[PDB]
Structures are given as structure tokens and as C-alpha cells.
Amino acid sequence: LKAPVVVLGAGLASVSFVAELRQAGYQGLITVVGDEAERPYDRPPLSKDFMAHGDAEKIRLDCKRAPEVEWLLGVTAQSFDPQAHTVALSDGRTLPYGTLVLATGAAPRALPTLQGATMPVHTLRTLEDARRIQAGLRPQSRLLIVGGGVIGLELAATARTAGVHVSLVETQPRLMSRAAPATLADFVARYHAAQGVDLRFERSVTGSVDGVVLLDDGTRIAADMVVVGIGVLANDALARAAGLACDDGIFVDAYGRTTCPDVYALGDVTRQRNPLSGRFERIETWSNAQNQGIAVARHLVDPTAPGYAELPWYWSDQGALRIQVAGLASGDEEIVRGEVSLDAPKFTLIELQKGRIVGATCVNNARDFAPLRRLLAVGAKPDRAALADPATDLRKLAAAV
Amino acid sequence: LKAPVVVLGAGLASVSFVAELRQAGYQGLITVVGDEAERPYDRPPLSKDFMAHGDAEKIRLDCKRAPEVEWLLGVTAQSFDPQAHTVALSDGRTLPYGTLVLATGAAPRALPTLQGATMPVHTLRTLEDARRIQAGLRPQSRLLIVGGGVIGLELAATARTAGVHVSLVETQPRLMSRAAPATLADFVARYHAAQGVDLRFERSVTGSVDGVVLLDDGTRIAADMVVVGIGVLANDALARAAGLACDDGIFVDAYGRTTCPDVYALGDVTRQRNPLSGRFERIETWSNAQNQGIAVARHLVDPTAPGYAELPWYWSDQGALRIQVAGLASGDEEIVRGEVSLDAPKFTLIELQKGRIVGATCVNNARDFAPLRRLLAVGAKPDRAALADPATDLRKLAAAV
Ligand SMILES: Cc1cc2nc3c(=O)[nH]c(=O)nc-3n(C[C@H](O)[C@H](O)[C@H](O)COP(=O)(O)OP(=O)(O)OC[C@H]3O[C@@H](n4cnc5c(N)ncnc54)[C@H](O)[C@@H]3O)c2cc1C
Ligand SMILES: Cc1cc2nc3c(=O)[nH]c(=O)nc-3n(C[C@H](O)[C@H](O)[C@H](O)COP(=O)(O)OP(=O)(O)OC[C@H]3O[C@@H](n4cnc5c(N)ncnc54)[C@H](O)[C@@H]3O)c2cc1C
Ligand SMILES: Nc1ncnc2c1ncn2[C@@H]1O[C@H](COP(=O)(O)OP(=O)(O)O)[C@@H](O)[C@H]1O
Ligand SMILES: Nc1ncnc2c1ncn2[C@@H]1O[C@H](COP(=O)(O)OP(=O)(O)O)[C@@H](O)[C@H]1O
Predict the structure, then answer these.
(1) H-helix or E-strand containing A130?
(2) Which of A243, A258, A261 sits opposite B254 (nearest CB)?
(3) Residue A106: other Cβ atoms inside 10 A
(4) Domain B1-105+234-312 sits in CATH 3.50.50.60
């Protein structure tokens, strides 16, 4: 840790990091460069209550645990020179750094086949995006969503609640192929279908003409608005240009170090080790942005601190479904706790590998999720019959281990 | 570049690197730690003329362009401490370093289903391995090779020349799936089949009993010896333990930097950017080991030098086939120069993407390969009709661009 500290990006990873630097006792300069002209804010509300209530003053991040930080909002870092230890800003200024931290997140992938579209086609990442989409959620209008990932499905649920007709096109045979157990994905499809979402599996968009979207089965979907949610791409351009190791994401170790001395990276922009799979992955979650930012800050201030070690997890709020998912989507065994039913949905899935818990899912069962994450963290090997048995208390099991 | 320099591994990447350090003018200490008790040697001969002639004194690497290097042969680096800047050796000594270079290569993957085998099962990476295999190439004996990659096929050709009966089991529908155009792989299969190799595609080994290997189609192959060639795994254990970013290979940028300050990596142990695909890959070639070692050395001595920028290529010698392959195995177009025939095989393949050359293959046509590599390097977009036309001189084309 060399002063001054400069962070590029003012999202959750950046805020979490700078707050932890302060809390851990670093008293040198901190400057944060954020391209959005917005008081730092959290993204999960954008496809949830914000999309429904529209009050941005409910979604701001708490920067009060980060005193004495200059936030340069509405400014873009254009490049950095890792020899000179400087960053070039879009407003013509240059910042010196001792330690540079790249927390620039990721951007929605565009759909090449809609590039020349003459109808509204949006993606959903920013507050500006959310406002633009919400303005078009007219009751009885038709929305097409491209992509059956969590954000697309959260938008689908939000739009149906708003009285919007929703169609959704997914290239895979299932929803949430990226990070969800098949049992969960099958149920989620049944839920959205029951709520009036017109789901099209194993279809892709081939183009569009005069307000109608074309599919690869040679058919058509008329829509008033298209929202594309086919994944994201790391915002790693400054890193690539500066000669850091990148591949749709900046490679970092558990200390957040890039291949360039004195340059670190955090959050959605990073490709990092998933301790459960033992492979490098881009981990695109709120918990990662916060926890990785905190861990990297802590170890910079106190080199005796361990590197980042948290196991992955996320949640999704889709209408009546409060979904929580931790760890790996599959192993060699799944245990189902509760009935999987559209009538008052409430269940837990547990994924095992050779008897060891490697993942878990809770649907409308938050009480079970914390204990399961603890069992997951220690690689617990509980009695499978006990894990299945409804009479088993999971909190006690986690306390006993 | 801080003295002293310590390199872990004494293969081609290490020798190439240390020779370049000297040639570029670095005069400080260089110490190389090599676990094999062997004068540094090249591996390609092991499945080629060595396997046939057995003279190791024809396969040694030239270390004369690396004066004043202490080579600690037959010694294993057990760990390094990147804070203390030391390396712990198996002989009880410790080496200090200013700059540490990890050039530890890769090891053959074992076949889990043969782990408890009670018949000879070998892999082919080292001189010791080659001697052990050669000792068992008894004429009229039966060899089973597991894996239809280049080393397995070179061994197949060598064994057939020696009068050994050869069967080969490949999980994929084709040979050389890793880095060869399908047109080449189809031809190579026809060649080996015509030479008496018993090829089994879309088969896997499930186990073995009393000198017989079992397959997943429920059948059997009797053999006197099994050689497993199912790929390699990076020797990145010291890097993983020391906290560097690794995933079956140490991530490096174009300067050879790892995520740990003052630690570099080179050759088979690295995962690095392929400029043609724009993705990170482990590049398992002789040309990479040499060229990456040279580039990393050059830039350490002269920071104004560019990073590593060479495009990938390899060769394989399989009986009557002298195969050369550069760049990508496929694009959106292949152009075939010459007839593809078992009668005096001689042809060239050119892979294009939107008219730009992205790969090339020469079979028994070395004269064409150099010009094609030059056209590939500049991303030439030659006239496709000219590229096909047998009347076209490729050397002139490369000279004109
Ligand atoms: C609609 C939506 C819903 C989500 N829901 C959930 C959820 O329910 N659960 C969950 O686990 N995760 C959810 N996520 C994911 C979560 O919000 C992200 O993982 C988190 O935002 C990543 O934070 P970050 O700081 O790494 O990146 P970001 O939040 O993207 O912040 C990076 C910032 O850097 C800025 N930037 C980029 N380049 C530059 C530059 N050159 N100069 C200056 N600034 C730059 C970007 O514009 C951005 O403002 C959701 C995300 C979205 C978009
Ligand atoms: C049989 C065979 C045939 C091949 N044919 C061709 C060919 O025709 N064309 C082509 O392009 N490529 C070919 N190759 C590939 C090429 O030889 C490799 O790409 C090259 O050997 C990689 O060199 P390297 O220095 O990175 O690694 P290596 O050659 O593996 O050297 C690394 C050295 O480090 C040692 N080491 C590992 N860990 C430690 C430690 N902790 N302490 C000390 N030493 C350690 C290893 O034992 C090894 O001696 C062939 C390889 C083999 C095995
Ligand atoms: N071209 C495409 N058309 C339709 N669906 C796609 C396409 N590419 C990817 N998908 C699907 O879109 C979904 C994206 O999900 P996810 O990765 O969670 O991203 P997002 O954050 O945008 O929801 C996945 O289920 C994936 O299979
Ligand atoms: N379990 C397996 N059984 C049989 N063949 C395999 C298995 N795993 C991989 N292979 C095949 O083995 C070949 C290995 O080729 P390559 O990657 O060049 O490695 P090598 O250097 O050992 O030849 C590939 O064609 C691959 O499809």
C-alpha cells in the first residue's frame, strides 16, 4: 500500500473497498473516479423495487464509512500509465497514484442481430437504463426480453406486475443456465409461465423489421420494446491498453493483484479463482463486489490478513419468488427439502459431491440459507438422511460443526 | 530486472531465456534450478529420432550462448517466499532472488481409470520416459496408445516403423482435436490406418484386468504396454502455494509478469493471450517456449522492447508426414492447395476469417510454410482465387505485402 490511492469506478466494489481502507486505518489520500454523474448507488434495486417505485433516493450506497474521499463523479478515466503512475481523465486532469485500483465493473452485451433495429431496444445496467425502461412499461404494452437470466426474469416479473404483456426468448433449453441448479430453473420456468410470461426456449433472435423481432425458427414476435439481457462484458479496456493480463475480465489473485505492479482490480471487472470449482471465473455478484473489495482493502492495509476467501452466492427476487443460491449449481447428488410446488413455493436444494456440500438453494426460505452457507464454507459432510428429513434443524447442524 | 536472477526449470524456455539475458547484456548472477539430473535437452526428438536412434547426445540444448550460469541439475525447488525473495531447494539450500522466473513446464495427465493397473502403463514427457518406452518397443509386441494427439501419433508411427502392433483409443470423433484443422485430422487418420494402426474413435478406457484394457463400449484390447497421451497439466504448484493467479497454468501478460511482483513465468507452465483468438490459452509448443523466453528476457533487460507478440505454430513428424500448423485451426473459410492423397502426400491448407488469413497447414511442403506464417503475421487479405490457384507463388506474395 503506497499513497495516494486512486480507484477507477464508483460502484459497490469501489465504495466497499474505500470504506474498508478507512476502517482498517489507512489515512492517506483516496480519490475515486466514477463515469456516471450519480451519487453512488446499488444495482439490485433497478430490476426490483426501483423499477416498481422509482425513488433513487432509496438505492444510494452509504459512503459515510468512507470519510475524506474525493469522488470525481461524471468523469471517465481514459488511460493510465503504470510506469509514470498517472491516470488521464476525460476532463483534462491527471491523477498521480501510489496504488491504482480498477473497479470498473461490466457492461451489458449487445445483441448483434438487433444492431440496426428501428424499434426501442434497451439493456438494463444503470439508473439511466432503468428510468428509460420504466418509462416504457405502459400497461397492456408488449415487452420482449432476450435472455432468460436473473435480470431478464426479474424484469419479466416486474413488467407482469405492472400489467405489461411479456415474451422471453432464451437460446438454451432452460432459464438461468449460468448459475442455477436445473431443479430450480425448471421450477422458475413453471412459475413465470403460470404468471403469463410467453417463454420461448432454444430460440435466438435473427433480426427485426418494422417493430417485429425475427427468430431462428423462422417466426415473429411483435413488441413495443425489447430489453436485451444476454450477459455482460468486463469493462477491462484500460487494463488491456496498459498491458495487464485480461480476457473478458482482469485476472487477479486473492490479494486483488493484477499482473501490473501497484495495480489491483475488484468486483465485476475481475476474473478470479472460485474456491469451490478451483477454476478462474468472472463472479458477477453483489456479494463478490462487496466482499472482494473489503478483503483486498484489508490486506493492503494489513499484509498479515488473509487473501479473499469467501464462497460465491447471490439472490434474485422474481415476483412471489425470493431465490437464494450459494456455491455450485451441481455435484453428484441433490437433496430436496420440502415440496416443489406453485402453491405457496417454499423449498431448499442441497448439492453434494462425494457427500460434501458444494451448493445450496433456498426459495422463500431465508432461515435455511445462512446455516447452509456455513455448512458449505467448511465443506461439511452431514448425514444425507438427516439433510432430507424435514424434522432436521439446519441451524443446529451448522452450530455443531 | 533486479539481480540476482533465479529460474526454476531447465527446459527450453529456461535455456532460451537465460541465453537471451546474456545476449541482451545482463551481466548479473543467473542461477537455474532443474529437477531432472540431465544436461538440458530438447523434447521433440523423444517421440521422433531419439525413439528410433537412442543417442541422447544428439538432443542436448546449446547452453553456450548462456555463459556464467550456474545450473543446479537434479535439484527440486520446493517453495518460494515472495516477501523474503528466497527459494527453498530439496538439497537444503536457499537461493536469494531479485527476479524469479517460473519455467517449470507441464506434466502428462494420468488416466484415472488405469491408476491401479497391473500392466505397464507409461507416459512420454522426459528422457527417462522415452528410454523406458523404447525398451518395451519389442517387434511384434502390442502397444495401446490412449489419446490421438500429436505425441500419441508420433509414437504410433515410430512403433509401426519398429514392427510393433499399435492400437489407439481416442475419446473424440477425430485425431488432434486440440490444434488441427479437421481436413488435416481426417487425412492423418487415413494415413495411420493405412500404416496398420488400429484406430478407435469415440472410445474411452474404463479400466484394465490381467494385461487387458477395457473400453466404454464394453469391449477389450489386449496389450503388452499402454502409453497414455491425453494431454498435460501445468507444473504450477509453487505458484499456487505462493499466492499467484493460476488455473492449470500461471497467468502472465506479454511481459511474462505473474500477479506477484518480481515473479515471471514462461513456456508450457503459462496461460497467456493468443493474439489470434484474443483469448487466454496454455500454448504447449516448442516455438512458444523459445520465443516467449526470448521476448520476456529481452524486455527485462530493455524495458523499451515490445512484449511477446509471436503467433502460435508447431510441427509434428509422423512417419512419412511432415506436418506444420500455424495459427487457428479454423475460420469461416478453408482453401486447399494441392491434392489431399495418400499417394505422395503434399498439400497446404489456408484458414481465413472474412478474407483474412488466420491459420495455415503444410504437409510435406516446408517451402510454403514460412511465407504463410508471414502472411498470417500481418493479417493479410490475399486474393482467394490466387491462394487456391496452383500457379501462385506464395513467397512472392509475402514479399509484396
Ligand atoms: C439490474 C441489476 C440487478 C442486479 N441484481 C443483483 C442481485 O439481486 N443479486 C446479486 O448478487 N447481484 C445483482 N446484480 C449484480 C451486482 O449489482 C454487481 O455484481 C455489482 O454492481 C458489481 O459492482 P462493481 O463495483 O464491481 O461494478 P459496477 O457496479 O458496474 O461499477 C463500476 C462503475 O465503474 C464505472 N466505470 C467503468 N469504466 C470507467 C472508467 N473508465 N472511468 C470511470 N468509471 C468507469 C462504471 O460505469 C460503473 O459505474 C445486479 C446488477 C444489475 C445491473
Ligand atoms: C515427446 C514430446 C514431443 C514434443 N514434440 C514437439 C514438436 O515436435 N513440436 C512442438 O512445437 N512441440 C513439441 N513438444 C512440446 C515442447 O517440447 C514443449 O512445449 C517444451 O518442452 C516446453 O518447454 P518448457 O521449458 O516450457 O517446459 P519443460 O520442457 O517441461 O521444462 C520444464 C522443466 O522444469 C522442471 N521442473 C518442474 N518443476 C520443477 C521444480 N519445482 N524444480 C525444478 N525443476 C522443475 C521440469 O521437470 C522440466 O525439466 C514435445 C514435447 C514432448 C514431451
Ligand atoms: N443471443 C442470445 N439470445 C437469447 N438468449 C441468450 C443469448 N445469449 C445468451 N443468452 C441467455 O441469456 C441469459 C443471460 O443470463 P445472465 O448471464 O444472468 O445475464 P444477465 O445479467 O444479462 O441476466 C442466459 O440464460 C443465456 O443462456
Ligand atoms: N480420457 C481420454 N481417453 C482417450 N483420449 C483422450 C482422453 N482425454 C483426452 N483425450 C484425447 O487425447 C488427445 C491428447 O492430445 P494433446 O492434447 O496433443 O496431448 P499429448 O501431448 O499428450 O499428445 C486429444 O486428441 C484428446 O481428445
Answers:
(1) helix A127-134
(2) A243
(3) 21
(4) yes
